[PDB]
Amino acid sequence: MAGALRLVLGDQLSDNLSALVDADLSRDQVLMVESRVEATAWKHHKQALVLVWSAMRQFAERLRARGFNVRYVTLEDPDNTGSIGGELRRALEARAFDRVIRTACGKWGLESHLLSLDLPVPMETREDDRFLCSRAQFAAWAEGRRELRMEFFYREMRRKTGLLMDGDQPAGGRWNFDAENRRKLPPGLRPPERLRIPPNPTTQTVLEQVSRGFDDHFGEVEGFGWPTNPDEATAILDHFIADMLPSFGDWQDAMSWRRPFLWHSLISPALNIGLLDPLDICRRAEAAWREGRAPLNAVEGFIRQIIGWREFVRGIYWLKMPEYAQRNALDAQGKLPGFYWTGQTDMACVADTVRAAHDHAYAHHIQRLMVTGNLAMLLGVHPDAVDDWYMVVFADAYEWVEMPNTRGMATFADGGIVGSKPYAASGAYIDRMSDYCKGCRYDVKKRLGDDACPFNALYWDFIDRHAQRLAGNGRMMMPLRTLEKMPDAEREAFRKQARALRVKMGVSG
Ligand SMILES: Cc1cc2nc3c(=O)[nH]c(=O)nc-3n(C[C@H](O)[C@H](O)[C@H](O)COP(=O)(O)OP(=O)(O)OC[C@H]3O[C@@H](n4cnc5c(N)ncnc54)[C@H](O)[C@@H]3O)c2cc1C
Ligand SMILES: Cc1nc2c(=O)[nH]c(=O)nc-2n(C[C@H](O)[C@H](O)[C@H](O)CO)c1C
Ligand code: SF4
Ligand SMILES: [Cl-]
Ligand SMILES: [Mg+2]
């Protein structure tokens, strides 16, 4: 009858967390740790550190106001062992407990370590039921499927959640209103100004501590504008729903120089730590369509990203780990170019993506996928180095979501499990979808020579290198038959260009 020690991690800041919902407030204690192991396993963006630790401190205060005894161990505490496991042991030695209760986390290596810890009391691990699909439900869906197609998973999630269902039929009589007709912004359309959250007093304190104590971590911390508690996160969501969602579908794949947010929701950093709930977000978007304040194609496209892609990538991560993290289907062995960290490249699209990561800890999906992701795949950068960049530079990065999007969708190192095909593209794609190329030093109409857009020769050398494997993929027919129709002299020409680019960029050779 000594009570339970209830662990809450930095991405578990939800009243409904499974480790909390049956607490005995008169006997139990919550443990929350600012852990330098977790902060440095990858050296996360300064803004990611500020976000998590500010949000953590405020959640602890919200728990105390509700009657919880909270043992909170800060980054400054001189007795903090630095690790979750060390701090569990320290808490169990400070007073009597009958058991530890925790919620399964979002990183296989940490989950595996915690499951193996030898503690003086039992540890009970509960599934994270903030997600809409359980790990077991995904495994059951996936069983027997030669290929995992997000669309079919998504339809099941629509039926299960009831989102955008009119009786037993999808709203509007189609499941998906996606189409491949998206374009860049018209020249006269200026993306709108976005709501930012000025740091509250707790956030300001953490910002000062991170600026002094983690100066070697990537990124700028001045200008921090992310929400750090439920009120701030709800303000950001309200702004998206009212002001941005009606145009969300039109501009979902566009890119505009030094306009990093466009009409995206900017909620992933808050949702991924628990400050928003995925079902609530989707119900709010559905209500906007049902009340006549947004079109169905925009609302369906937004919901598909949360109950479709987000749940799907989590499902594949837990289905396939730990071997997933060792897959390298294309035998990529190159080094990551230094300009991924410094931004010092004349490729305007790449430079702008690195700039947004540095200044905001954010870039939207198409930029992550088709600029820096595609480039790394075409260069043949080793997947560990690519994962290590995406885990550092964005404030929504956790392995369960980063890895299937990066090792899977963006670079095909998983051989197509997540994405079915490589999302390889030349500069022509970036030119069509962005305003980058007019002002770029390089010429997107050229493949060879010092003025040619590097993506153009790298794209064709990638298709060439992997032509047989992509033939046995079936989803690359338009490019492979273009390749086969080029004369040997044309193919040799772009092979030499791509080889020279990989040496110049510090990748290999
Ligand atoms: C290489 C690469 C790495 C990525 N790494 C991460 C990561 O570490 N963390 C992360 O949360 N997302 C990651 N994504 C997915 C996606 O790019 C981000 O979720 C999105 O950019 C967040 O911006 P937003 O909140 O403005 O989203 P919106 O464009 O407004 O989309 C709405 C919501 O849908 C979800 N979402 C959309 N696309 C995806 C997706 N492919 N996978 C999962 N959720 C999705 C998010 O919850 C997002 O908030 C990655 C994508 C790629 C291509
Ligand atoms: C930056 C950071 N800091 C902490 C921390 O101080 N304490 C903690 O308990 N968790 C932290 N996390 C989250 C974990 O590193 C990890 O990514 C998630 O628990 C994965 O589910 C992160 C990401
Ligand atoms: S020309 Fe090539 S490198 Fe320059 S912005 Fe366009 S796609 Fe990017
Ligand atoms: Cl993680
Ligand atoms: Mg000590």
Residue 21 resides in a domain: yes
Task: Looking at the structure, tell me whether residues 185 and 261 fall in a common domain.
Answer: yes
Question: What is the CA(29)–ligand 2 centre distance, in A?
Answer: 19
Task: Looking at the structure, tell me whether residues 290 and 168 fall in a common domain.
Answer: yes
**Cα–Cα distance between 275 and 32 in angstroms, integer?**
16
Buried b (16+ CB within 10 A) or exposed e, 136-156: ebbeebbeeeeebebeebbee
Residue 282 among known ligand-binding residues: no
CATH number (domain holding residue 17): 3.40.50.620
CA-CA distances (angstroms) from residue 156 to 152, 153, 305, 313? 7, 5, 14, 15
Residue 430 near residue 473 (C-beta atoms within 8 A): no
Question: What is the CA(271)–ligand 2 centre distance, in A?
Answer: 14
Question: What is the CA(449)–ligand 3 centre distance, in A?
Answer: 14
Q: Which two structure tokens, joined as six digits, stand for 483?
A: 């390749």
In this structure, which ligand is nearest to the CA of 37? 2
| Residue with CA closest to ligand 2 atom 10 | 10
**What resolution in angstroms does the PDB record give?**
1.5
Task: Looking at the structure, tell me whether residues 256 and 314 fall in a common domain.
Answer: yes
Task: Looking at the structure, tell me whether residues 148 and 167 fall in a common domain.
Answer: yes
Q: How far is CA 213 from the centre of its chain?
A: 26
Residue 73 resides in a domain: yes
Q: Which of 297, 308, 302, 312 is nearest to 171 (CA)?
A: 297
Residue 285 near residue 24 (C-beta atoms within 8 A): no
Task: Looking at the structure, tell me whether residues 474 and 378 fall in a common domain.
Answer: yes
Question: What is the CA(364)–ligand 1 centre distance, in A?
Answer: 7
Rounded to 10°, the helix 454-465/477-485 angle is 90
Residue 452 burial (CB count, 10 A): 19
Residue 332 resides in a domain: no
Task: Looking at the structure, tell me whether residues 299 and 418 fall in a common domain.
Answer: no
| Residue 104 near ligand 2, beta carbon < 6 Å | no
Q: Which residues line ligand 1 (CB under 6 A)?
A: 264-268, 271-272, 302, 305-306, 309-310, 313, 364-365, 368-369, 373, 390, 394, 396-397, 401-402, 405-406, 409-410
| Residue with CA closest to ligand 1 atom 19 | 268
Could you give the residue ranges of the DSSP H alpha helices within 434-487?
A: 454-465, 467-471, 477-485
Tokens 């971590």, residue? 217
Domain boundary among 96, 126, 156: 126
71 pairs with which residues across the strands? Answer: 31
| Residue 402 near ligand 2, beta carbon < 6 Å | no
> At CA 404, angle to CA 399 and CA 405, rounded to 5?
100
| Residue 377 near ligand 2, beta carbon < 6 Å | no
Residue 325 resides in a domain: no
Residue 34 resides in a domain: yes
Residues 6+ apart with CB under 8 A from 293: 242, 246
**For the chain, percent helix, then strand, then coil, each to nearest 5?**
50, 5, 45
- In ligand 3, the atom with minimum distance to the C-alpha of 347 is 3
**Cα–Cα distance between 57 and 78 in angstroms, integer?**
18
**Cα–Cα distance between 506 and 336 in angstroms, integer?**
7
DSSP 264-285: ----HHHHTTTSS-HHHHHHHH
Task: Looking at the structure, tell me whether residues 248 and 359 fall in a common domain.
Answer: no
Residue 106 among known ligand-binding residues: yes
Residue 205 resides in a domain: yes
Tokens 């022509």, residue? 428
Q: Which of 53, 37, 40, 44 is nearest to 113 (CA)?
A: 37
Task: Looking at the structure, tell me whether residues 173 and 309 fall in a common domain.
Answer: yes
In this structure, which ligand is nearest to the CA of 457? 3
Q: Tally the C-alpha atoms within 13 A of residue 404's C-alpha that lie toward its C-beta.
A: 25
Q: Tally the C-alpha atoms within 13 A of residue 144's C-alpha that lie toward its C-beta.
A: 2
| Residue 35 near ligand 2, beta carbon < 6 Å | yes
Domain boundary among 77, 102, 126: 126
Residues 6+ apart with CB under 8 A from 172: 296, 300
Each as own residue / partner, the long-range contacts of residues 382-387 (CB below 8 Å, 24 or more positions apart, any chain) are 382/328, 382/332, 382/333, 382/334, 382/335, 382/336, 383/327, 383/328, 383/332, 383/407, 383/411, 383/413, 385/334, 385/335, 385/336, 386/336, 386/410, 386/411, 386/413, 387/325
Residue 411 near residue 439 (C-beta atoms within 8 A): no
Residues 6+ apart with CB under 8 A from 348: 257, 436, 437, 439, 440, 441, 442
Residue 327 resides in a domain: no
Q: How far is CA 285 from the centre of its chain?
A: 21
Residue 349 among known ligand-binding residues: yes
Question: What is the CA(492)–ligand 3 centre distance, in A?
Answer: 22
Residue 368 among known ligand-binding residues: yes
Residue 204 among known ligand-binding residues: no
Q: How far is CA 166 from the centre of its chain?
A: 31
Strand-pair category, 165-166 with 169-170: antiparallel
Residue 433 near residue 370 (C-beta atoms within 8 A): yes
Task: Looking at the structure, tell me whether residues 34 and 84 fall in a common domain.
Answer: yes
Residue 30 near residue 6 (C-beta atoms within 8 A): yes
Question: What is the CA(401)–ligand 4 centre distance, in A?
Answer: 9
Residue 326 resides in a domain: no
**Cα–Cα distance between 145 and 136 in angstroms, integer?**
15
**Cα–Cα distance between 285 and 414 in angstroms, integer?**
33
Domain boundary among 292, 320, 348: 320
CATH number (domain holding residue 147): 1.25.40.80
Task: Looking at the structure, tell me whether residues 295 and 360 fall in a common domain.
Answer: no
Q: Which two structure tokens, joined as six digits, stand for 390?
A: 């995406």
Query: How many structural domains comprise the chain?
Result: 3
Task: Looking at the structure, tell me whether residues 152 and 285 fall in a common domain.
Answer: yes
The parent domain of residue 45 ranges over 4-126
Task: Looking at the structure, tell me whether residues 97 and 155 fall in a common domain.
Answer: no
**Cα–Cα distance between 131 and 162 in angstroms, integer?**
15
Residue 301 among known ligand-binding residues: no
Question: What is the CA(80)–ligand 5 centre distance, in A?
Answer: 7
Q: How far is CA 151 from the centre of its chain?
A: 19
Q: How many residues does the chain have?
A: 509
CATH number (domain holding residue 443): 1.10.579.10
Residues 6+ apart with CB under 8 A from 272: 11, 396, 398, 401
Strand-pair category, 99-103 with 4-7: parallel
Tokens 């992310």, residue? 226
Residue 67 burial (CB count, 10 A): 9
Neighbours of ion ligand 4 (CB under 5 A): 107, 398-399
381 pairs with which residues across the strands? Answer: 334
